[PDB]
CSV table of C-alpha atoms in Angstrom, one decimal:
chain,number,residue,atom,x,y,z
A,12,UNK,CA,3.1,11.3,9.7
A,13,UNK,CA,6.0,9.5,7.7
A,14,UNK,CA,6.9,12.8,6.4
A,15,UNK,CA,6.8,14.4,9.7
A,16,UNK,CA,9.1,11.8,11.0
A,17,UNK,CA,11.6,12.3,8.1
A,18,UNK,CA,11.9,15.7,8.7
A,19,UNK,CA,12.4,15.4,12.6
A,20,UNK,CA,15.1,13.1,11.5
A,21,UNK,CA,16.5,15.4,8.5
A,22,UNK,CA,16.9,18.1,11.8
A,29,UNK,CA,31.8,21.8,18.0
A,30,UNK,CA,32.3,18.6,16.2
A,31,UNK,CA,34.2,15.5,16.4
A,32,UNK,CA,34.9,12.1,14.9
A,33,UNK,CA,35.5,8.6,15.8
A,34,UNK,CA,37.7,5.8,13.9
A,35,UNK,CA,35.6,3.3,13.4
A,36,UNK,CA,37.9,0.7,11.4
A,37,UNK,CA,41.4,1.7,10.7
A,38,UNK,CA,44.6,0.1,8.6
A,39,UNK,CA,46.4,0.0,5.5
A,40,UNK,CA,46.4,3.2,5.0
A,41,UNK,CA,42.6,4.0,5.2
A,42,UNK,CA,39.8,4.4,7.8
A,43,UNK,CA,36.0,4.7,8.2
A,44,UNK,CA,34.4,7.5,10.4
A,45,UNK,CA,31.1,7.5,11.7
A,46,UNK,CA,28.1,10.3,12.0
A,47,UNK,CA,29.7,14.4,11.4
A,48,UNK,CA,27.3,15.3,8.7
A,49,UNK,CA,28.5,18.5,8.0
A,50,UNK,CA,31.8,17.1,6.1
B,14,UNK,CA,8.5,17.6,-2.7
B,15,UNK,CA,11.8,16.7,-3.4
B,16,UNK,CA,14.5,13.3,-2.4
B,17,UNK,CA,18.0,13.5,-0.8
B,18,UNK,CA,21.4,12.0,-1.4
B,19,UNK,CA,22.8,8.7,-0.1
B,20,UNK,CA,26.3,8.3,-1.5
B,21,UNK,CA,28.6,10.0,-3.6
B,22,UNK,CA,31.6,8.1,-5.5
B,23,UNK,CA,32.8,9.6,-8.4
B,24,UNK,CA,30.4,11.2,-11.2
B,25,UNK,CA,27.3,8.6,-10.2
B,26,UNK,CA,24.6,9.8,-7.2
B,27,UNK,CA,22.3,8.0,-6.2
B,28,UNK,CA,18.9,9.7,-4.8
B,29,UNK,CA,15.8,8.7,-3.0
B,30,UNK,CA,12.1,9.8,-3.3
B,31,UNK,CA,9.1,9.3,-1.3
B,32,UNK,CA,6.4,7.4,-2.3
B,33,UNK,CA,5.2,8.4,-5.9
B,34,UNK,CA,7.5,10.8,-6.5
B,35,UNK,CA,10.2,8.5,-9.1
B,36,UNK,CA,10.5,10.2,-12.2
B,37,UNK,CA,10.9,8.9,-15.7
B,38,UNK,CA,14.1,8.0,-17.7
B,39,UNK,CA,16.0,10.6,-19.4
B,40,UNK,CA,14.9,13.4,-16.8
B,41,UNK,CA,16.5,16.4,-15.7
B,42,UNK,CA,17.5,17.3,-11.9
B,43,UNK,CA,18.5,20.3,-10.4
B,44,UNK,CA,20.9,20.4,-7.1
B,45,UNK,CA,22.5,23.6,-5.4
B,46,UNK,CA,25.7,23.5,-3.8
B,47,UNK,CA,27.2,25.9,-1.3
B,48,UNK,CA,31.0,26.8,-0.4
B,49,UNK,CA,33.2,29.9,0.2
B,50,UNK,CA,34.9,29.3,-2.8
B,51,UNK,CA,32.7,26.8,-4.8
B,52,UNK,CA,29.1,27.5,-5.4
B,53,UNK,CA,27.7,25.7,-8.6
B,54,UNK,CA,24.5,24.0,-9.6
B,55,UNK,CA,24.9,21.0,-10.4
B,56,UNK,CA,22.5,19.2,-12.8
B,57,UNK,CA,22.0,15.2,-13.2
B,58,UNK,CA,20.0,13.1,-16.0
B,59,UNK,CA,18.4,9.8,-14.1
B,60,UNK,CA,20.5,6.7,-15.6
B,61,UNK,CA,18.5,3.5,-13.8
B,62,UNK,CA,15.9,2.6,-10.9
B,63,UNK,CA,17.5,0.8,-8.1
B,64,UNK,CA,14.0,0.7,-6.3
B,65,UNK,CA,13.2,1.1,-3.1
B,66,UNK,CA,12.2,4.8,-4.5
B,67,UNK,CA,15.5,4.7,-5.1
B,68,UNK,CA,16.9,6.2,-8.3
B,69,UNK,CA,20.9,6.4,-9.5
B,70,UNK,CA,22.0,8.8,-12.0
B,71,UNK,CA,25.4,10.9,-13.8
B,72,UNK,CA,25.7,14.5,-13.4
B,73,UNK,CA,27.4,16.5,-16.0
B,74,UNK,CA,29.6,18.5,-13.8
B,75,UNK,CA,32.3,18.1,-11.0
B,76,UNK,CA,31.1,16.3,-8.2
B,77,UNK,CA,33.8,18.0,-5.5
B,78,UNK,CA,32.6,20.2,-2.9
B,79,UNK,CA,29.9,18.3,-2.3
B,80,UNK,CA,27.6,17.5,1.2
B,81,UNK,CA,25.0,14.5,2.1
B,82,UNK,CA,21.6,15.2,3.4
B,83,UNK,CA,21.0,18.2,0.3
B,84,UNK,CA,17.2,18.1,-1.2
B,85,UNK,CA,17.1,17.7,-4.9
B,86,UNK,CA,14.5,19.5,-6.7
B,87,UNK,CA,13.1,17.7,-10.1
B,88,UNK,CA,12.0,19.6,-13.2
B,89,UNK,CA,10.1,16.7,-14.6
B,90,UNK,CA,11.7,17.2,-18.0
B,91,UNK,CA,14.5,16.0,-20.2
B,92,UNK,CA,17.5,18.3,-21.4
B,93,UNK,CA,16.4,20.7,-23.9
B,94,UNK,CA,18.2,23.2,-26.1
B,95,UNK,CA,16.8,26.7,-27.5
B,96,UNK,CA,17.1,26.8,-31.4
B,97,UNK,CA,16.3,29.4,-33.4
B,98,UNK,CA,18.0,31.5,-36.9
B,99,UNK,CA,20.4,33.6,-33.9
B,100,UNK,CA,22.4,30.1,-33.5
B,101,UNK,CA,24.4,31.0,-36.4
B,102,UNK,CA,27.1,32.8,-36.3
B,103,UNK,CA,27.4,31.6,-32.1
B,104,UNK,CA,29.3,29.3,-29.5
B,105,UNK,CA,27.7,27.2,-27.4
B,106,UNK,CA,28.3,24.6,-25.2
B,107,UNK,CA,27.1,21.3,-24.1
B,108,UNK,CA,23.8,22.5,-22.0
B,109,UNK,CA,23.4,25.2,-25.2
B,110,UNK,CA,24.6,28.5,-23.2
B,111,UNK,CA,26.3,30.5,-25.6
B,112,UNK,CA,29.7,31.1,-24.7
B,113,UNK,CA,30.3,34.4,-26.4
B,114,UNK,CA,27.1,36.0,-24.6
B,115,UNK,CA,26.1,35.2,-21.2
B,116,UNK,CA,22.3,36.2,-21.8
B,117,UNK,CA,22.6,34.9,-25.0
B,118,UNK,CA,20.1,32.3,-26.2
B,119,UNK,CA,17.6,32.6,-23.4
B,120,UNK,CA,14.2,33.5,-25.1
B,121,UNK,CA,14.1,30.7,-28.1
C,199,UNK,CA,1.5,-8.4,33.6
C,200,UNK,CA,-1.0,-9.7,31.5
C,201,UNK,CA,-1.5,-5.9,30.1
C,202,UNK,CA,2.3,-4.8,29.8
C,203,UNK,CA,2.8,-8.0,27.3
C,204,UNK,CA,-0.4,-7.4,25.6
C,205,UNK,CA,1.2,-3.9,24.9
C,206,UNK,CA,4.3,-5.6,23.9
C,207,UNK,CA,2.9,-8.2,21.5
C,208,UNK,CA,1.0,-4.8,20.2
C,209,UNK,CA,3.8,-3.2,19.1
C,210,UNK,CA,5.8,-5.4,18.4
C,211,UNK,CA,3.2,-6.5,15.8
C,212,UNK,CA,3.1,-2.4,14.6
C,213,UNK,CA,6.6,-2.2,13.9
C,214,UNK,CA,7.1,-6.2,12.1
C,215,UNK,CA,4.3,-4.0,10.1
C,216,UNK,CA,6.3,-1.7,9.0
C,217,UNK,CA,9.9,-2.4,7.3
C,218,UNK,CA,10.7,1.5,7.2
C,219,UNK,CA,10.7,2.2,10.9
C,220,UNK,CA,12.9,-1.4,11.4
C,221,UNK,CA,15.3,0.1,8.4
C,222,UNK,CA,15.7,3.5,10.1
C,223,UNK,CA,15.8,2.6,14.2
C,224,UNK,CA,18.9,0.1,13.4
C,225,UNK,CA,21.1,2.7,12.3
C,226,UNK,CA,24.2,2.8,14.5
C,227,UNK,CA,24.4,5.9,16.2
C,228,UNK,CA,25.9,7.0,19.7
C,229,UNK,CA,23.0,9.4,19.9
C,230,UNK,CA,19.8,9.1,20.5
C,231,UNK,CA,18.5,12.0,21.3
C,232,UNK,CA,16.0,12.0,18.0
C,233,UNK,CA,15.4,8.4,18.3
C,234,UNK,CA,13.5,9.4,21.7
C,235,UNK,CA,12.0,12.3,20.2
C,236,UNK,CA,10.6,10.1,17.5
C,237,UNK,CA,9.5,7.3,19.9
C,238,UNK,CA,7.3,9.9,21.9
C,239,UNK,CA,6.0,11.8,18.7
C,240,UNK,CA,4.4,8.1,17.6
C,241,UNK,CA,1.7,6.8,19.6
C,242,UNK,CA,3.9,7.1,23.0
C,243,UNK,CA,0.7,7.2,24.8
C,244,UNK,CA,-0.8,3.7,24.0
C,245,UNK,CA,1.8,2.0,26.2
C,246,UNK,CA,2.5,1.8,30.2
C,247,UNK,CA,5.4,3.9,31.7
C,248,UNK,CA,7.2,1.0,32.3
C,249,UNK,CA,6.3,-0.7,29.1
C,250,UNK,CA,7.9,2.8,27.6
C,251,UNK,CA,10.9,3.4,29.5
C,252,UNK,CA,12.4,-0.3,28.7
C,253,UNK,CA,11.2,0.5,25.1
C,254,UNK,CA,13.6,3.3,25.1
C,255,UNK,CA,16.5,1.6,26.8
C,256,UNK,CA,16.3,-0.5,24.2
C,257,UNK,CA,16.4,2.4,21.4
C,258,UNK,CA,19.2,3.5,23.4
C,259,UNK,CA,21.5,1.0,23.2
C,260,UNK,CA,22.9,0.0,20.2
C,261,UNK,CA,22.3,-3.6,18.4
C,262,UNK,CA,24.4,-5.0,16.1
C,263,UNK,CA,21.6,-6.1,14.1
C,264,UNK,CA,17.9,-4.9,13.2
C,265,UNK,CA,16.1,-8.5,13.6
C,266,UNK,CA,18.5,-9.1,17.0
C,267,UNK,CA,16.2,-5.9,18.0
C,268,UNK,CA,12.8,-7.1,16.9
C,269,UNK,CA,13.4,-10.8,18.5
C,270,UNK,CA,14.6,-8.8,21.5
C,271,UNK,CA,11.1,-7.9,22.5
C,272,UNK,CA,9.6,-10.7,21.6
C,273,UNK,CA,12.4,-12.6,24.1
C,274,UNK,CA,11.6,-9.9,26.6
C,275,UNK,CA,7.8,-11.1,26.4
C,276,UNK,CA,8.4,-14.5,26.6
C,277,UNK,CA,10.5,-14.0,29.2
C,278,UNK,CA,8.0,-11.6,31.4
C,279,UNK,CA,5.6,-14.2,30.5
C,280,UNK,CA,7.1,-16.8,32.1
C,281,UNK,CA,8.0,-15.1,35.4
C,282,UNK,CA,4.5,-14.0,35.6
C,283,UNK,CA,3.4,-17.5,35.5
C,284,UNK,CA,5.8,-18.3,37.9
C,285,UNK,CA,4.9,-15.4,40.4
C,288,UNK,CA,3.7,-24.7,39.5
C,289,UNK,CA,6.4,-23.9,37.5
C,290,UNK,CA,7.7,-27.4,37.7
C,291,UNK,CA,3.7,-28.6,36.3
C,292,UNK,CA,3.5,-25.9,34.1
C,293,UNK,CA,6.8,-26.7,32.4
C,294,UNK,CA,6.1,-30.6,32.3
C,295,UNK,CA,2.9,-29.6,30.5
C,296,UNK,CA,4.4,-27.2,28.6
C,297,UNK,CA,6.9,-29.8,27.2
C,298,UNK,CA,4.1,-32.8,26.7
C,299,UNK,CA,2.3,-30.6,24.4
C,300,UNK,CA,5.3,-29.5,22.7
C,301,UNK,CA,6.0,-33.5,22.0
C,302,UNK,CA,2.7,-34.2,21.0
C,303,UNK,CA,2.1,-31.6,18.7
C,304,UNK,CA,5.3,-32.6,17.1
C,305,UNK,CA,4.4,-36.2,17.4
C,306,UNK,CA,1.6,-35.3,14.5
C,307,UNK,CA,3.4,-34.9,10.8
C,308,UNK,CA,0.7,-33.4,9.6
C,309,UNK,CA,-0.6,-31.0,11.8
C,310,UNK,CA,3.4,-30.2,11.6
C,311,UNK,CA,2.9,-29.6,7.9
C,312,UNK,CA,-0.3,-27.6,8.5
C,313,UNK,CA,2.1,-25.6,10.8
C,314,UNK,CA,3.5,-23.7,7.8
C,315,UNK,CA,2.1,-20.1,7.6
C,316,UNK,CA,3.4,-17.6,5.0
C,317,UNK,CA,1.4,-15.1,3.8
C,318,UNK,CA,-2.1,-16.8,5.6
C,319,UNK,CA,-4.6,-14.9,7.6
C,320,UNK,CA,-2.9,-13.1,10.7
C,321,UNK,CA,-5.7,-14.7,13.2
C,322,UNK,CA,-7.8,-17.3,11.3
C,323,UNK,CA,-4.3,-19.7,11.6
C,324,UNK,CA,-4.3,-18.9,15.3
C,325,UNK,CA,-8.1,-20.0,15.6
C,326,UNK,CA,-7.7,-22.9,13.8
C,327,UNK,CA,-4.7,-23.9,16.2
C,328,UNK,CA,-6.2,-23.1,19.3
C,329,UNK,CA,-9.0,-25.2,17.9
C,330,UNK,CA,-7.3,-28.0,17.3
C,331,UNK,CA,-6.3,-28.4,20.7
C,337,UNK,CA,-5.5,-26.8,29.4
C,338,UNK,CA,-2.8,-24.1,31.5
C,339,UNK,CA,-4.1,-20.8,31.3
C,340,UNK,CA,-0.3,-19.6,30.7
C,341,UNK,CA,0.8,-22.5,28.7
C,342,UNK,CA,-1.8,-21.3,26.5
C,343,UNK,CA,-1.2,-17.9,26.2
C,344,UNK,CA,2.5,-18.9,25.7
C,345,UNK,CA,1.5,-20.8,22.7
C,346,UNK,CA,-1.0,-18.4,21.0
C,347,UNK,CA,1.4,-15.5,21.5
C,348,UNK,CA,4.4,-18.0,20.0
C,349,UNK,CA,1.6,-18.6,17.1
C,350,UNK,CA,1.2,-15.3,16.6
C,351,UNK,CA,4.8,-13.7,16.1
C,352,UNK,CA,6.2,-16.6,13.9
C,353,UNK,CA,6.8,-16.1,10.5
C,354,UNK,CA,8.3,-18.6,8.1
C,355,UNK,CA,10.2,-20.9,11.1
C,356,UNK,CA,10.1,-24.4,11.8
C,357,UNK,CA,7.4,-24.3,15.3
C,358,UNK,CA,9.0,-27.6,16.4
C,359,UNK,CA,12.1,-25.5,16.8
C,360,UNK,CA,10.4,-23.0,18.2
C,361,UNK,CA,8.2,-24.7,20.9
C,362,UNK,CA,11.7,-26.5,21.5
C,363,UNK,CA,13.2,-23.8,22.1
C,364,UNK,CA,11.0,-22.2,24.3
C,365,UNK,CA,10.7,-25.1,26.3
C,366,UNK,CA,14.6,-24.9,27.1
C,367,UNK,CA,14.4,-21.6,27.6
C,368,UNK,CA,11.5,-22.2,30.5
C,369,UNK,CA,13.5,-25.2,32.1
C,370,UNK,CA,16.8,-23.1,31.5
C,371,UNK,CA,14.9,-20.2,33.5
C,372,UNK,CA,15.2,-22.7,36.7
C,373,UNK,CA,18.6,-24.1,37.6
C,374,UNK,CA,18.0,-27.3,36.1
C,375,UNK,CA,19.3,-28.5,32.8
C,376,UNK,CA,17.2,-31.0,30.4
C,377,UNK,CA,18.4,-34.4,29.7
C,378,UNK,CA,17.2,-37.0,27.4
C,379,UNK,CA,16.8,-40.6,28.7
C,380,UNK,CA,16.0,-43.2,26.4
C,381,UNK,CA,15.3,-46.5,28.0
C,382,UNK,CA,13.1,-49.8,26.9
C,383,UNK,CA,10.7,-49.5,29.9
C,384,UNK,CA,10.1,-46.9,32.8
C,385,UNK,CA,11.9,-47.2,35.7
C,386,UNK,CA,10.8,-47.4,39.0
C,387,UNK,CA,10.0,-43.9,41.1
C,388,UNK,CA,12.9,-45.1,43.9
C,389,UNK,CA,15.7,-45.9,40.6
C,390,UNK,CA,14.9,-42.4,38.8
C,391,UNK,CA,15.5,-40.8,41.9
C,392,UNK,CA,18.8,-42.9,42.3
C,393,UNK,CA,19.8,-41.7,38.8
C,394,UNK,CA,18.8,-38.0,39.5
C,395,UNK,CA,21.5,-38.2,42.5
C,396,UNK,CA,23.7,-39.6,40.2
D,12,UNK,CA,-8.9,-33.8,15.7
D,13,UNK,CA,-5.9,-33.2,13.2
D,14,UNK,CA,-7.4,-34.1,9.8
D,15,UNK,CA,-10.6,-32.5,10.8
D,16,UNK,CA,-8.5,-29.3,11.9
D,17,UNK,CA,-6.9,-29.6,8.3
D,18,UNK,CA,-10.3,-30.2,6.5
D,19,UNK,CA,-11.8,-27.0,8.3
D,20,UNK,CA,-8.7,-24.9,7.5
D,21,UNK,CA,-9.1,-26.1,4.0
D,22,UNK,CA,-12.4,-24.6,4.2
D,29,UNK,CA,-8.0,-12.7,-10.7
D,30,UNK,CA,-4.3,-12.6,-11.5
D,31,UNK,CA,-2.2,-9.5,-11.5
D,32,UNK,CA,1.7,-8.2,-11.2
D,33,UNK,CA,3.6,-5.6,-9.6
D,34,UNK,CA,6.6,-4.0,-11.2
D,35,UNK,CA,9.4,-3.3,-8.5
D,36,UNK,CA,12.6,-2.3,-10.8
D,37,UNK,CA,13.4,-1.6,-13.9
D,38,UNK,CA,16.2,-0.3,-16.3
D,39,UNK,CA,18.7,-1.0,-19.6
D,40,UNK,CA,15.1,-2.3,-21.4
D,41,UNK,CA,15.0,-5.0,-18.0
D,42,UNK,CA,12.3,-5.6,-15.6
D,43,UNK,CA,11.7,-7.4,-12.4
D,44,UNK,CA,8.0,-8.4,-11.7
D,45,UNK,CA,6.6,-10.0,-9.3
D,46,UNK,CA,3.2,-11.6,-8.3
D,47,UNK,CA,2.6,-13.8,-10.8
D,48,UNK,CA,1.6,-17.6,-8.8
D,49,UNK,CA,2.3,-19.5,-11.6
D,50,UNK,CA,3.3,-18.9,-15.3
């Protein structure tokens, strides 16, 4: 059933800043980069 | 069966397995990437166990144009070479394809 | 009530089982569309509808934490616990709080306390033996139970603040040579 | 009741490999070596 769940969770767009500053940033979730 | 990718930061992946499914040291693993104007396969010789059926590795080829989430299939073997009386007088490089014939040095 | 935290201490136990399913359901994500999905593909149909839909409220919204989450339920419990018992609070809390302090009194049924890696029930047995209010003592077993590797002075401390801060009162610790008389505490409670 | 409660609760070896690598091992297991 573990298998089963990892595959349920292997299954437009757009981002979100999640921290931002000196010059660089983090972005959550979008996958498809 | 097959792992998937975690994080990518220069030449060293690092990959994760299900339960017994961790290969050796000194294996050989085989990845396909996809793009419009870069499709390669990339292939990666398992460097240490992190646990957690968590394995990280190098990979012998450019690591750009890559994407998370992409199975990894595992021949369960080292890197090999063919050899044979044809090598002389031939190129080859560092996986052993020889560079002046594509289909060259396929059958030893 | 009695049956909604039975299915509560249920799975909670279940998923402090399993450190996979704790790894995976803290990821921080403004979906949760799968996390449902999952929730009702794994034994969905053990637990109450009620029981369920405040399970998945709490899949929904994110935690900064993983063990903020699994202490959540176990809070949650407690908590529903208590208000059932209420549904005598003043008695049941007084007792509450004499056990608590005489259980600690005892050093070494305070060292005994220490459970890591011992039998899941046989502890609990021995506990219960060892030693009423029907609720106080479901409150303790299920506090037995769901430890793991935490002082229980703290924690029986803790939950007796938690009962008395429930009511609008607030604890206070008098230390004195002698008891006073009923008409003078009452004179210092006014106070 | 609290030494009694103590005296009824009163009442081979092997390891487990977790990592590995660069000829270095972590066991684990072991009580006392």
């Amino acid at each position: 059933x573990x298998x089963x769940x990892x595959x349920x969770x292997x299954x437009e767009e757009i981002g979100t800043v999640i921290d931002a500053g000196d010059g660089i940033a983090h972005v959550e979730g979008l996958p498809s980069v | 069966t097959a792992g998937r990718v975690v994080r990518i930061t220069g030449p060293v992946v690092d990959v994760e397995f299900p339960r017994g499914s961790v290969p050796e040291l000194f294996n050989a693993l085989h990845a396909e990437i996809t793009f419009g104007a870069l499709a390669k396969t990339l292939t990666l010789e398992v460097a240490q166990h992190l646990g957690d059926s968590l394995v990280r590795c190098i990979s012998m080829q450019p690591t750009d144009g890559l994407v998370r989430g992409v199975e990894v299939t595992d021949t369960g073997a080292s890197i090999s070479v063919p050899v044979g009386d044809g090598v002389k007088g031939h190129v080859f490089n560092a996986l052993g394809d020889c560079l002046d014939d594509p289909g060259y040095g396929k059958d030893f | 009530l009695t049956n909604l935290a039975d299915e509560l201490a249920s799975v909670a136990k279940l998923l402090l089982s399993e450190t996979a399913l704790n790894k995976h359901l803290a990821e921080p994500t403004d979906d949760s569309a799968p996390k449902v999905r999952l929730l009702e593909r794994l034994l969905s149909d053990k637990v109450s509808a009620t029981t369920l839909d405040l399970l998945r409220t709490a899949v929904s919204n994110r935690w900064s934490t993983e063990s903020n989450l699994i202490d959540a339920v176990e809070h949650t419990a407690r908590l529903a616990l208590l208000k059932r018992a209420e549904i005598e609070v003043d008695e049941v809390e007084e007792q509450l709080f004499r056990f608590g302090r005489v259980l600690d009194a005892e050093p070494r049924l305070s060292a005994l306390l220490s459970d890591y890696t011992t039998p899941a029930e046989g502890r609990v047995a021995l506990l219960d033996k060892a030693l009423v209010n029907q609720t106080a003592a479901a409150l303790l077993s299920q506090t037995v139970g769901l430890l793991r590797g935490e002082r229980a002075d703290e924690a029986v401390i803790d939950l007796a603040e938690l009962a008395v801060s429930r009511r609008g009162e607030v604890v206070a610790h008098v230390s004195a040579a002698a008891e006073l008389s009923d008409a003078q505490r009452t004179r210092l409670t006014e106070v």
